[PDB]
Specification:
Chain B: Belongs to the MCM family. The structure is cut from a larger assembly and holds 1 copy of chain A (140 residues) and 2 copies of chain B. Chain A is mainly α. Chain A has helices at 7-19, 34-51, 58-73, 79-96, 104-115, 122-139. In chain A, helix 1 (7-19) packs parallel to helix 3 (58-73) and helix 5 (104-115) runs antiparallel to helix 6 (122-139). Chain B has 139 residues and is mainly alpha-helical. Chain B starts with a strand and ends in a 7-residue tail after the last helix. Classes of the chains: A mainly alpha (140), B mainly alpha (139). At the B-C interface, strand 1, helix 1, helix 2, helix 4 and helix 5 of B face helix 1, helix 2 and strand 1 of C.
Chain lengths: 140, 139, 96
């Protein structure tokens, strides 16, 4: 049984786990689901069973943690922010599944194709178009 | 189904805080009413009290419906209908039961309208963001 | 008892009491409380009773609490029945 307040640490560990795994979504996610937070518990207690230690250690927690991590990696293989997110998203995917390069216009092309779903009004389209264009013009 | 509860959508710093504290709290174990008195409370109120609205000042609701209806027709389909009006009233008087109020009050209405209206909002497509801006007066 | 129901904030307190171990949401529990707590039937002489209940569609998401919440309701409510989907956990939803 872990009464120990080093459990607090576990939170940030849970917290450390999902953040880097939020973007991209093209990573191994999952989510990472809260059920995984819930999983880290039974894992911890498991390692406690292993080592006979009671109230465990933050270290054993880190072991269960890294374990889940490799189990994840094996699965891997505002305006400007949204556009910069597009840049990082496209590159991060294409670097892992390709070199990335090619026609810069295409990036705007498929970008408009994706954001067209979020467009509430024509002003949102026009803004997104002129922003992505502004970023590319600034970038070059 | 009158009330639709739709969960979303992604994690976050604080959300992970808030959650993890709760889970950890649970596993470590080994303001709200005591469960027993609430589970008595409910039965008690359902048996005894039958709240009722009074025709005089509640005409407002009608207006509200209109205020919701037409402006919602511009975007999204349908879903709104007089049914979805009736659910307002009924839910409101449920809250009137929690108040043990014997009659319907404006507070209850506030609560209800927030419930059903946010329910309707959250069902719609992402264009419902455009909806949100008129929810303010309804808020 | 009566003296407790008099404060206005009792509502919120109750909702907060409604699903302790989930940590839940304020909304999704609010619906639960509302439908679980009641409504008025209410028969119009002599014809139609409308409906006195609130039907909650809780639309979940894998990993969300969507199961556990309703399980609470089986413990708390007076008469509460768990039919699962089918297949079945008795009872099976169809009178026969």
């Amino acid at each position: 049984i872990l009464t120990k307040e080093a459990r607090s640490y576990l939170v940030e560990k849970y917290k450390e786990l999902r953040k880097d795994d939020a973007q991209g979504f093209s990573r191994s996610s999952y989510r990472i689901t809260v059920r995984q937070l819930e999983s880290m518990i039974r894992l911890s207690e498991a390692i406690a069973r292993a080592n006979c230690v009671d109230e465990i250690t933050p270290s054993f927690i880190a072991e269960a943690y890294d374990l889940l991590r490799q189990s994840i990696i094996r699965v891997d293989v505002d305006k400007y922010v949204s556009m910069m997110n597009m840049i990082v998203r496209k590159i991060a995917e294409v670097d892992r599944e390709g070199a990335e390069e090619l026609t810069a216009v295409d990036i705007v092309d498929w970008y408009l194709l994706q954001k067209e779903n979020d467009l509430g009004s024509l002003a949102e389209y026009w803004e997104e178009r002129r922003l992505a264009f502004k970023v590319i013009k600034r970038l070059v | 189904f009158d009330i639709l509860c739709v969960v979303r959508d992604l994690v976050d710093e604080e959300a992970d805080e808030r959650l993890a504290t709760f889970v950890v709290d649970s596993h470590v174990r080994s303001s709200p009413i005591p469960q027993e008195l609430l589970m008595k409370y409910i039965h008690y109120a359902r048996t005894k009290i039958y709240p009722k609205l009074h025709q005089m000042d509640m005409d407002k609701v009608s207006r509200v419906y209109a205020d919701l209806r037409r402006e919602s027709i511009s975007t999204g389909s349908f879903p709104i209908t007089v049914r979805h009006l009736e659910s307002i009233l009924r839910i409101a008087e449920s809250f009137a039961k929690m108040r043990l109020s014997e009659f319907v009050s404006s507070y209850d209405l506030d609560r209800a309208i927030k419930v059903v209206v946010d329910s309707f909002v959250d069902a719609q497509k992402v264009s419902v963001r455009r909806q949100l801006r008129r929810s303010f007066a309804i808020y | 008892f009566r003296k407790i129901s008099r404060d206005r904030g009792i509502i919120d307190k109750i909702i907060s009491s409604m699903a302790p171990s989930i940590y839940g949401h304020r909304d999704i529990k609010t619906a639960v409380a509302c439908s679980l707590f009641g409504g008025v039937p209410k028969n119009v002489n002599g014809k139609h009773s409308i409906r006195g209940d609130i039907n909650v569609l809780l639309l979940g998401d894998p990993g969300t609490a969507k199961s556990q919440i309703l399980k609470y309701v089986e413990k708390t409510a007076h008469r509460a029945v768990f039919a699962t989907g089918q297949g079945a956990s008795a009872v099976g939803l169809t009178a026969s």
